Coordinates of C-alpha atoms in Angstrom, one line a residue:
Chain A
X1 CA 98.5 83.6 134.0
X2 CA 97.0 86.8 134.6
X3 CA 94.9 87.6 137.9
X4 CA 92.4 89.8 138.9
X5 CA 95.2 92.8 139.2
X6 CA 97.4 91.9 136.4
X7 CA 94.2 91.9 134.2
X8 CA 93.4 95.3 135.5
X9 CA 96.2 96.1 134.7
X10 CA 97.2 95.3 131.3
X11 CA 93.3 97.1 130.1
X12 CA 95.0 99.9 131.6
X13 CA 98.3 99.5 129.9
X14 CA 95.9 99.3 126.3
X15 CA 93.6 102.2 126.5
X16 CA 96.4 104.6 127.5
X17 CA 98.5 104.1 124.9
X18 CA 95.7 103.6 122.4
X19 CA 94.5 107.3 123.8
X20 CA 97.9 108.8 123.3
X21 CA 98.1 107.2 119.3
X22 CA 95.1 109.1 118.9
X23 CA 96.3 112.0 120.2
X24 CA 100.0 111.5 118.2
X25 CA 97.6 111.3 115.1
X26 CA 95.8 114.4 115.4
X27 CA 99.6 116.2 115.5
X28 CA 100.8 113.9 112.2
X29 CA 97.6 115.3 110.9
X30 CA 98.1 119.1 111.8
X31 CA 101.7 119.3 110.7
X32 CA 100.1 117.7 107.3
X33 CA 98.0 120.6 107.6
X34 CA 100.6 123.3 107.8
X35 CA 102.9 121.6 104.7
X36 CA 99.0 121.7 102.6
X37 CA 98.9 125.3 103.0
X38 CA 102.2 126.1 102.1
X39 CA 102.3 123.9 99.1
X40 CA 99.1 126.2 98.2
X41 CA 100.8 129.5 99.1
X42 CA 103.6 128.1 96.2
X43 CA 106.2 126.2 99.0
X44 CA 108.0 123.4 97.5
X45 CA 107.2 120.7 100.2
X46 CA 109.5 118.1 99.6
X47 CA 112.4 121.0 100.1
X48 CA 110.7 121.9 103.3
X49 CA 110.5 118.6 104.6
X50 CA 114.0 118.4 103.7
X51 CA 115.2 122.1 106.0
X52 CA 113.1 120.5 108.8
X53 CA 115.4 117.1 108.2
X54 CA 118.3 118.9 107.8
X55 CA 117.6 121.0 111.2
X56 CA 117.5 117.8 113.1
X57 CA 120.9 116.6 112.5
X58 CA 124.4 117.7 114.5
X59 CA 125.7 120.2 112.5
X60 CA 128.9 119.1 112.7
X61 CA 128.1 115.5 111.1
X62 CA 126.0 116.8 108.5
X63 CA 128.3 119.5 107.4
X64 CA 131.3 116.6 107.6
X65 CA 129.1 113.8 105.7
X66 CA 128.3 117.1 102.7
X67 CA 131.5 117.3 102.7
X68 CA 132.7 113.9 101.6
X69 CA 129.6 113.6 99.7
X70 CA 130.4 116.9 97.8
X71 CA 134.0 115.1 96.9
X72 CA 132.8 111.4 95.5
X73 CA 130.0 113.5 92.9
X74 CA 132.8 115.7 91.5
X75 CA 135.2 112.4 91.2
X76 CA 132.2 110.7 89.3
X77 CA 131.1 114.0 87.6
X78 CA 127.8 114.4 89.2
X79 CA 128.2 117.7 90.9
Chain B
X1 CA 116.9 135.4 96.5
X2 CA 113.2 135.5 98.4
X3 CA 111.6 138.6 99.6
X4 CA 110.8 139.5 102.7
X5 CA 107.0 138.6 102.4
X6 CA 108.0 134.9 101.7
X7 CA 111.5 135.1 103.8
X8 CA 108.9 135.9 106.7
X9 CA 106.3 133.2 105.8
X10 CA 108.8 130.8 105.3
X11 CA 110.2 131.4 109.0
X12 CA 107.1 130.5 110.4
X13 CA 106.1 127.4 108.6
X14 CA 109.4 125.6 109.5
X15 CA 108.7 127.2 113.0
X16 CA 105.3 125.4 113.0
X17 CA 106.1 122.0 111.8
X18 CA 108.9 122.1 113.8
X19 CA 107.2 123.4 117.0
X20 CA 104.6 120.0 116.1
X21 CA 107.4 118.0 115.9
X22 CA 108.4 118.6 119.4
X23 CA 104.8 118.1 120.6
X24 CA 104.7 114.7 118.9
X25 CA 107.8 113.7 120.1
X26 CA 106.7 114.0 123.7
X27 CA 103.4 112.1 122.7
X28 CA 106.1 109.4 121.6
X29 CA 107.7 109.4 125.0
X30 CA 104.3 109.1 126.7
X31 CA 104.0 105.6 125.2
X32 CA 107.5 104.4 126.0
X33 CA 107.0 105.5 129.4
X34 CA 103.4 103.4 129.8
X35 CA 105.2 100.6 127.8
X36 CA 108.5 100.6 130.1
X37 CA 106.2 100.9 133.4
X38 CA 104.8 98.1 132.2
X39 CA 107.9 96.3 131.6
X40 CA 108.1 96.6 135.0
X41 CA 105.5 95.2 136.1
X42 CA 106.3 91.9 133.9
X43 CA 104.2 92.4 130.8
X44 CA 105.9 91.6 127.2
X45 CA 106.1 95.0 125.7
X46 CA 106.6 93.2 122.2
X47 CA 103.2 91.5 122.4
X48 CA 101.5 94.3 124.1
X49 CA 102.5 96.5 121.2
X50 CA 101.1 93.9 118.7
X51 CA 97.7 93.6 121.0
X52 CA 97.3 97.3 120.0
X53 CA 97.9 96.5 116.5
X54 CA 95.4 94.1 116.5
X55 CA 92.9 96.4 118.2
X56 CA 93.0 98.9 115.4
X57 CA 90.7 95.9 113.1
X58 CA 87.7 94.6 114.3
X59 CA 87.6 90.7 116.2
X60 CA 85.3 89.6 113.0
X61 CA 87.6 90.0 110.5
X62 CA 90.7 89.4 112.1
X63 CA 89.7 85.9 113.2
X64 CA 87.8 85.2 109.9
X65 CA 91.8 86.1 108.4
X66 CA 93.2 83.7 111.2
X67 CA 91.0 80.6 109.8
X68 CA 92.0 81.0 106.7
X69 CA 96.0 81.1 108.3
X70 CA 95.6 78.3 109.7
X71 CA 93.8 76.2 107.3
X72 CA 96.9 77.5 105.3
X73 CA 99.0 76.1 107.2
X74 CA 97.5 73.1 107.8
X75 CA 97.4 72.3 104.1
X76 CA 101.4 72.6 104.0
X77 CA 101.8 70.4 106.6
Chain C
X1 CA 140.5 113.9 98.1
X2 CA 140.5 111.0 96.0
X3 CA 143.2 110.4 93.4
X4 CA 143.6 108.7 90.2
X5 CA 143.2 105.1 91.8
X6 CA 140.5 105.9 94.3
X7 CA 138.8 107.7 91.7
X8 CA 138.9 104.8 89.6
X9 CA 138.0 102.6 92.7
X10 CA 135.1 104.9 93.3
X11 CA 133.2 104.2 90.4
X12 CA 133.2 100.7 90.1
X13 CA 131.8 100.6 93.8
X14 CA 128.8 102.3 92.3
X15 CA 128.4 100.4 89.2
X16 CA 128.6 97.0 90.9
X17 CA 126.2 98.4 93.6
X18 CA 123.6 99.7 91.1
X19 CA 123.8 96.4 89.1
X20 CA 123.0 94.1 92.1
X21 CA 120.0 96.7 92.5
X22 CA 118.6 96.4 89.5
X23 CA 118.9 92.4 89.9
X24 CA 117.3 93.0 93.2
X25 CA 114.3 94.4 91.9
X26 CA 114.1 91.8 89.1
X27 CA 113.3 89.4 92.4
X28 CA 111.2 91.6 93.6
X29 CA 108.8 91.8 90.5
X30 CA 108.8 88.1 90.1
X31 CA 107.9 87.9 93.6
X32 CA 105.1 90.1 93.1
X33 CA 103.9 88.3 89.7
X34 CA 103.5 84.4 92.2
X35 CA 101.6 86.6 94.2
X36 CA 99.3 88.1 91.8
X37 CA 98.8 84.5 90.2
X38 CA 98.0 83.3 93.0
X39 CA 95.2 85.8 93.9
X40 CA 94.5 85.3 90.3
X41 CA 93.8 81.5 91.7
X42 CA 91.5 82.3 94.2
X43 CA 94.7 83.0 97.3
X44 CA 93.9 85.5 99.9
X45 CA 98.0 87.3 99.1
X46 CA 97.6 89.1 102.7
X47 CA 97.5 85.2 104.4
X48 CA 100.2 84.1 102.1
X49 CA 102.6 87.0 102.9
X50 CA 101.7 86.2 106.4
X51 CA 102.7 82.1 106.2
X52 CA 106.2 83.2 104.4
X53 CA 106.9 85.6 107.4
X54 CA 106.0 82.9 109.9
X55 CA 108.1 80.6 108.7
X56 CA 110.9 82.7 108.5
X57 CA 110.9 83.4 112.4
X58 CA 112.1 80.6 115.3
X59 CA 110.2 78.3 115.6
X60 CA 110.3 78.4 119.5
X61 CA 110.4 82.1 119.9
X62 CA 107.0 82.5 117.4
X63 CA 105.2 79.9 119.7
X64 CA 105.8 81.0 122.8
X65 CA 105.0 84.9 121.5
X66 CA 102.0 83.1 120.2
X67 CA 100.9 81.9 123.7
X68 CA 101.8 85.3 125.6
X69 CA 99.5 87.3 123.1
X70 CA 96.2 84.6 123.3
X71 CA 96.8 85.0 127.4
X72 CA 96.6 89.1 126.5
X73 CA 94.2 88.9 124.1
X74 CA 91.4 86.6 126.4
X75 CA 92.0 88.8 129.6
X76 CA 90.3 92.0 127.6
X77 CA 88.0 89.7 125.9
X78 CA 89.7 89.5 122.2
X79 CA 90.0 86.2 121.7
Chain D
X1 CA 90.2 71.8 105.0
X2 CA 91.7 72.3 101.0
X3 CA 91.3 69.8 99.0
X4 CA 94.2 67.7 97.1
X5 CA 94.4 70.6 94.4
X6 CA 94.4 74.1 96.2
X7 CA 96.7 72.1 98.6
X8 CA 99.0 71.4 96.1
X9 CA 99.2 74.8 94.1
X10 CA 99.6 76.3 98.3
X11 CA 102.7 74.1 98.9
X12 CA 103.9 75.6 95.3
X13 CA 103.0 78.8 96.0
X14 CA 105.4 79.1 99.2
X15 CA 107.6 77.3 97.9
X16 CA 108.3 79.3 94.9
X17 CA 108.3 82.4 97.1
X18 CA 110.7 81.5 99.8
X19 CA 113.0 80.3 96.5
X20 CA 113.0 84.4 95.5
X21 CA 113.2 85.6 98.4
X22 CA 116.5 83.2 99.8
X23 CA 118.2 84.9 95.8
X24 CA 116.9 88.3 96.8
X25 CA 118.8 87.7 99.9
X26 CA 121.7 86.7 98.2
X27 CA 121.8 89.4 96.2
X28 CA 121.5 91.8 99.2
X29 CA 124.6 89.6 100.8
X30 CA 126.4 90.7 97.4
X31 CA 125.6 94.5 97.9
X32 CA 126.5 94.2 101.6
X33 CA 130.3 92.7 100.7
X34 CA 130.8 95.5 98.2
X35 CA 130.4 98.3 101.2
X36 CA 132.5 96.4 103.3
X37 CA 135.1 96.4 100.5
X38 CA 134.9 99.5 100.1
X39 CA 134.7 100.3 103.7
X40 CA 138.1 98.5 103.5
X41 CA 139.5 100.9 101.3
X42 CA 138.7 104.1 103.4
X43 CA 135.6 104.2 102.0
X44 CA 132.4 105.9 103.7
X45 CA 129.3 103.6 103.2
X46 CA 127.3 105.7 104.3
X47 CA 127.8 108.7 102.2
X48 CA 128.0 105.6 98.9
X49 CA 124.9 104.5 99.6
X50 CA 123.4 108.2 99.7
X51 CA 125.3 108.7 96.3
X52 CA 123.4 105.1 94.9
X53 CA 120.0 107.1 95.5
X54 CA 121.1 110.5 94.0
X55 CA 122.0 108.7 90.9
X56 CA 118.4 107.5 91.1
X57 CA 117.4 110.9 89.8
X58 CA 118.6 112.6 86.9
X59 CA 121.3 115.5 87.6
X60 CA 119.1 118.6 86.3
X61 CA 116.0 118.2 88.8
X62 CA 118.9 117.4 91.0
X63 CA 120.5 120.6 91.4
X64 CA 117.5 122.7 90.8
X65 CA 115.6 120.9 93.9
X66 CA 119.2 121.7 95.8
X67 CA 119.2 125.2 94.7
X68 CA 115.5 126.1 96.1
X69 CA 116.9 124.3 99.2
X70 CA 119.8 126.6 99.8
X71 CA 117.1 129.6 98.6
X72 CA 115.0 128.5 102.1
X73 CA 118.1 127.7 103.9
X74 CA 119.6 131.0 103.4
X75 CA 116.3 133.3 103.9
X76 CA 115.8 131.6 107.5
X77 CA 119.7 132.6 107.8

């Protein structure tokens, strides 16, 4: 079971991640903030969402993986 | 081709989201670092992570939803 | 690049995938019409959901998750 | 504690479920056999299963969603 340290313990354990998912919602919320006032200033959102995706990746694999993407479309005339 | 009014704009938009992203992601290793200290000190970071998950709805409700589980499953044997 | 065969190949790969999709999502709606019968019937669908996903799990690993959350839960007074 | 009838219709209720769900998962087994065919035959699975969800949308938003993109990609250089 848990004893008088362990129980300390684990409140801890709770209330400082719960603080932290607060704090990790106020940024989810402010970067919903910034895409809301681009889509007002005439941004296409999903295509930004999409740069910032595209940003993440290696370079390397997402240029290779475009690549052989880019070949299967033509083959099934889709690109 | 955009101009250089929403060239500029556009610049500091991905720089913003992006420079949030960051900032989030270190919030994110915050919480692995509390759940793998606490890995260390024996605890079940599986359950502790559902123990937050349950904290997010009230005790009321979340055993009034548990009665009715178990008087579920009771019924199927 | 792909040639006459591979091309061929190619395009039965994504016509036999997108047939078992379409199948899959014929499950999925008749899935959804039990459920909304059976809310229909007086069911709470959240508790139902939550019996099918219990039974799907070991039996000995659920129970003895089971037990290490009510010791978690009764040390911060949740339980 | 149900009674004999909402006892019954519960046991037919899961039942009936877990029967969908065990020929969803077959189907899913079938989709997972084709990849690894074609995975066989130098396939990438990967980049088929990205070409499955472009086909999901028709080829003229397609390409006009992709040209903005390259628009934004090329003004942040």
């Amino acid at each position: 079971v848990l004893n008088s340290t362990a129980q300390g313990q684990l409140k801890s354990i709770i209330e400082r991640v719960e603080r932290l998912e607060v704090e990790k919602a106020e940024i989810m919320e402010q970067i919903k903030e910034v895409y809301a006032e681009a889509k007002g200033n005439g941004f296409d959102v999903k295509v930004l969402k999409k740069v910032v995706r595209i940003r993440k990746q290696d370079r390397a694999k997402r240029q290779e993986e475009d690549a052989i993407l880019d070949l299967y479309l033509s083959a099934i005339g889709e690109i």
